[PDB]
Design a protein around this nucleic acid. Structure first.
Lengths: 32, 95, 129, 76, 99, 196, 63, 106
RNA sequence: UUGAAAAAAU
RNA sequence: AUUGGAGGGCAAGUCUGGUGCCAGCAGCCGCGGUAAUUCCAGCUCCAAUAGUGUAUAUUAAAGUUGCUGUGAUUAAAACGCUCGUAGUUGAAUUAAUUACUUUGAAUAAAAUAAGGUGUUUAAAGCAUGAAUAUUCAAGCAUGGGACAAUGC
RNA sequence: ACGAUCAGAUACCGUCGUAGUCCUAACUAUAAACGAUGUCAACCAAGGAUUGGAUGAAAACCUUGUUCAGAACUUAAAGAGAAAUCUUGAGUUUAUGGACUUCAGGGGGAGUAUGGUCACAAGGCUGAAACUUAAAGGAAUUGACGGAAGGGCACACCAGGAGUGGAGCCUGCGGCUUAAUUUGACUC
RNA sequence: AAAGAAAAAGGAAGCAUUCAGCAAUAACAGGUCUGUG
């Protein structure tokens, strides 16, 4: 986006909204 | 070059649309390229709507309305004053 | 498909600096991609970078400060003889005191300023203004 | 993107960050060869050609991996 | 013009001379075979100059001249827009004094 | 004489000494008389005369459009365009616009830091219309290897050794000089290493 | 050898063009950046570094 | 076809794409030695057969004096432009006349 | 409702 | 001491007689249909100078053959679409050949650029012989394995 | 094939009618087969809205948040272009190189001839030269023009009055005539 | 909200009160060298 944000460290709220493969470290959304 | 961005028609993701017949000249025109107008008209015009009510055998009869959808082509759509030629920067108006 | 991982990386950095971005992300990180950034850090065209470990050739974040003008890759790496350096400097670089080529040699990745001193040639990876 | 249809899906499994048959399933070609009853199904005839080349693509690769002996040949 | 000076300079000097002599505007017209066999015509103007009205009788100073050249004849017309010195005010004018 | 802008007053009252100070801070030169004071003795040059015609219901209103480029050989150049009925005013009206459109031209060396500055510091290309002119640094030997039309301009800008490659419809003198002028306009916008 | 030492943008650290008229200069006691709406936010990243602003931009946007 | 090992496609493409020019192609077809009345010769000697006058094109007017000349090496017929004003009188019937091209190449 | 054409160059 | 020109490209005449879209000049744009800056002539100067016009062919301009270096909506030009062999191009990762790269050896002279050398200068000539560098493509031996091709 | 209209109409307008239009089986393989925009891949400003899913709140449908795929749209003071325009590129290109395939080299001749090949056939695919010519062509500006539209105006017309054209005569013009019947002007 | 439009009364005169002269930018290859010293 035009409004640049810090991406080396992401916010905890913004990580949970991104696609599971588009995070800084892709992690599954499944439990158990 | 391109006088219109959508080439006059209104099809984007389909390669073919069935033809329809123009209501004035009967010219085969595509479904999207056609000019579609929906007409609502009472069978009895306003100059004679009260004439029926003076002598009507019923009591609370409400006169119905005619429901016809007219499709024109460009050749007699413009000639019929349904649409007109617009300015170059006024062509984008879509309301 | 992805033919050259370096080619897509450099154009990401070139486009980012044209938009004034402060740091950009390159999803793949090969050995040459990291090595190429090391050549551009000695000239102080970038401040520093990082290599996130993702177990799938993790991303790289490049920190840049409005200094990189045009970093580009070169289509299949041509064999640059030592005597042939003058041919490429006069074309690929803007001036004799500004540009910096990048080459790959057996002694590791080197730039044109130092590879001439080491007296060696080899293939060419790209350049940066 | 897909090999034949120009669709680009990115749905995947994501094996987490911690460490603590395909050829047989394509012989779909048998199921389509339905072709005998509907000989005019030109859309299934085209889709069968794609599947036939898919099998003729794993055959060419599995042979170089020595999984299948070089005498393997697919016939209906 | 008889001396051979170009119309762009010889006329311009006179057309400047009238300008700083208190004249509101001037009109100089030259026509003839000045350039080639085909005829041409140029009309020069500076300042303010009205053309329609009775004021064209009480404010104009016109004169028509013809100069014979080696090739033919050239006509020259000069009309000068006078000022308030030939006393008399124009039609459209208010000039409201302020206290 | 009789300035009306803020910058025009300071130059008239001897508060601004060098033209480059105006260029350094992006100030806009809104009067041509300012250039007549900071840079006296400006060489004049008129590249060509073009007659443009407008068709009307009676005839063709022919008007003359003049391209001129002025600037001392020390490193300043400009270019202005103006059209009017009379040829005398077309050059006269182009004097003003060329003065208002002066830009500082940066020059450097080619191989060694030996006085004095002769050539462009690096490679630049004028972002004109269909014409694209590329400037290449040249050694002390070769002069301005260029077409006669941009050679007249590059002499005024002060460059004495340069190499040019011309692409596009170069027969259009309106865009030929404006390609070179735009090439030298961005000479100071290119951030080299020494300007860090 | 240099006509003048050119100015520099304090937001993106690139040179200021000789005729970039849309540029500004703010003294409290580039043109292309301004015309995108970034000049408002980019200054906030620069104001807060020197402390003129305290808690206007979140810490996850300050680079 | 930019690849380092693809030096056959690029060469074959240029060999194919070079045949489409109107100028160099004339230098490899065997037509200069066959259809050109001059061939590769600078000048052609011939014999006069007929005196003819070709009217100019649409914008211009007038009759251009010319002669129909039959060569001695090929025997073909070519119309030749008599050079100067009133120079048609100098030429005669059955005499050696030199014919050598024109300003436009070939 | 009908409604065709305007010799070549300056 | 001549050749060609004196409308633009391209240096040079706002000179006088004839011809009246006819003769004609013009590589191109064009100049001539009774007031020719271009024709046939009379006067002058413009470029070169033992030189100068002409016709053909080679090269550069031509980024109009394009690896360096083109264009593909409308100027010329994206196969109607898909499958597919040859061909080209093929993600990251490891603390036996070949290619690549640095060196040498040998490598006809003449010639290319020249080292030296007042044929009076120069073109020349070698009257100390420049180490003279030359070898693109291949081949021989060798330091290195980043990028690469070959499969256990 | 008739009937109209027209100078003619062998056409547009009206009426009738064989092939065809429909299904099967076998051929043909061309279209403005068009988004006149090849296929795969990385980056890419702001905004509304839509189709199919996944995840929360609101308790299958409806309102809303995050995210993936798809056909599109609005703005751009930015990028490109010769301009129209393009932005899910026609951007990242004289600061020129991500990988691959095809096509084009001024306009005619001409997709013609010959040769080869496929098809029952019409035809398709491959496909030049001889010769001829300073232009052909692309996007936008002004003007003019429209048996194109919109808005206004004029004894231009409507409602009329007087008439001219018809008759004798004055006069001018063309024509004939002559020794000469002097000449300029030829729609407003 | 306005420039303005219309009726009637008054007024000698209320369509710009009516009719007239001058009347711009640019052009015709319009007529006159049978008007001229």
């Amino acid at each position: 986006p035009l409004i640049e944000v810090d991406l080396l460290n992401p916010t905890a709220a913004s990580e949970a909204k991104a696609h599971k493969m588009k995070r800084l470290v892709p992690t599954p959304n499944s439990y158990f | 070059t391109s006088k219109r961005r959508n080439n006059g028609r209104s099809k984007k993701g389909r390669g073919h649309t069935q033809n329809v017949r123009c209501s004035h000249c009967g010219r085969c025109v595509p479904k999207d390229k056609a000019i579609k107008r929906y007409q609502i008209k009472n069978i009895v015009e306003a100059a004679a709507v009260r004439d029926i009510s003076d002598n009507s055998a019923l009591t609370k009869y409400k006169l119905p309305k005619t429901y016809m959808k007219l499709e024109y082509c460009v050749s007699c759509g413009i000639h019929g004053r349904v649409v007109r030629v617009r300015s170059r920067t006024d062509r984008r108006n879509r309301l | 498909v992805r033919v050259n991982v370096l080619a897509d990386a450099l154009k990401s950095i070139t486009n980012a600096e044209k938009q004034g971005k402060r740091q950009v992300m390159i999803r793949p990180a090969s050995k040459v991609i990291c090595e190429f950034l090391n050549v551009m850090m000695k000239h102080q065209y970038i401040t520093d970078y990082t290599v996130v470990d993702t177990h799938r050739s993790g991303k790289i974040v490049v920190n840049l400060n409005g200094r990189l003008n045009k970093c580009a890759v070169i289509s299949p790496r041509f064999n640059v003889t030592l005597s042939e350096f003058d041919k490429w400097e006069a074309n690929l670089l803007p001036s004799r005191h500004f540009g910096a080529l990048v080459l790959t040699t057996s002694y590791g990745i080197l730039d044109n300023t130092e590879a001439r001193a080491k007296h060696t040639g080899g293939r060419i990876l790209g350049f940066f203004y | 993107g897909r090999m034949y249809n120009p669709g680009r899906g990115i749905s995947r499994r994501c094996i987490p960050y911690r460490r603590s048959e395909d050829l047989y399933f394509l012989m779909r070609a048998v199921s389509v060869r339905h072709l005998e009853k509907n000989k005019k199904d030109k859309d299934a005839k085209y889709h069968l050609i794609l599947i036939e080349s898919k099998i003729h693509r794993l055959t060419r690769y599995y042979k170089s991996a020595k999984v299948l002996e070089a005498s393997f040949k697919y016939d209906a | 013009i008889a001396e051979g000076l170009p119309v762009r300079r010889a006329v311009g000097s006179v057309m400047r001379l009238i300008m700083d002599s208190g004249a509101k505007g001037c009109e100089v017209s030259i026509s003839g075979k000045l350039r080639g066999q085909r005829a041409q015509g140029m009309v020069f103007k500076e300042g303010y100059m009205i053309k329609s009205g009775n004021a064209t009788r009480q404010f104009y100073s016109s004169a028509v001249r013809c100069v014979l050249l080696r090739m033919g004849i050239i006509g020259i017309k000069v009309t000068i827009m006078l000022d308030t010195d030939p006393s008399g005010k124009n039609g459209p004018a208010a000039r409201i004094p302020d206290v | 004489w009789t300035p009306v802008t803020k910058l025009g007053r300071l130059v008239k009252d001897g508060k601004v000494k060098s033209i480059d100070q105006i260029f350094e801070f992006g100030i806009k030169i809104k009067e041509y008389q300012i250039v007549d004071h900071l840079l006296p003795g400006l060489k004049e040059e008129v590249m060509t005369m073009q007659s443009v015609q407008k068709q009307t219901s009676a005839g063709q209103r022919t008007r003359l459009k003049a391209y001129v480029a002025i600037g001392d050989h020390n490193g300043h150049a400009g270019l202005g365009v103006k059209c009017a009925k009379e040829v005398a005013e077309a050059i006269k009206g182009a004097m003003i616009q060329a003065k208002l459109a002066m830009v500082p031209v940066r020059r450097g060396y080619w191989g060694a830091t030996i006085g004095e500055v002769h050539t462009v510091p690096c490679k630049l290309t004028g972002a004109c219309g269909s014409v694209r002119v590329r400037l290449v640094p040249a050694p002390r030997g070769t002069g301005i290897v260029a077409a006669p039309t941009p050679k007249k301009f590059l002499i005024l800008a002060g460059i004495e050794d340069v190499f040019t490659q011309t692409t596009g419809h170069t027969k259009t003198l309106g865009n030929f000089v404006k390609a070179t002028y735009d090439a030298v306009r961005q000479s100071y916008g290119f951030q080299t290493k020494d300007l860090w | 050898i240099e006509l003048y030492i050119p100015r520099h943008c304090s937001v993106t650290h690139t040179l200021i063009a000789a005729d970039d008229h849309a540029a500004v200069q703010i003294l409290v006691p580039k043109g292309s950046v301004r015309k995108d709406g970034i000049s408002d936010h980019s200054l906030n990243r620069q104001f807060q570094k020197d402390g003129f602003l305290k808690t206007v931009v979140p810490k996850n946007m300050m680079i | 076809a930019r690849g380092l090992h693809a030096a056959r496609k690029m060469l074959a493409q240029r060999r194919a794409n070079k045949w489409a020019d109107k100028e160099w192609k004339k230098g490899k077809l065997v037509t200069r030695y066959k259809c050109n009345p001059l061939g590769t010769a600078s000048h052609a000697k011939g014999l006069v057969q007929e005196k003819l006058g070709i009217e100019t094109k649409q914008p211009n007017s007038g009759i251009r004096k010319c002669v129909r000349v039959r060569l001695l090496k090929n025997g073909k017929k070519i119309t030749a432009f008599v050079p100067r004003d009133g120079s048609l009188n100098y030429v005669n019937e059955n005499d050696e006349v030199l014919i050598s091209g024109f300003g436009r190449r070939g």
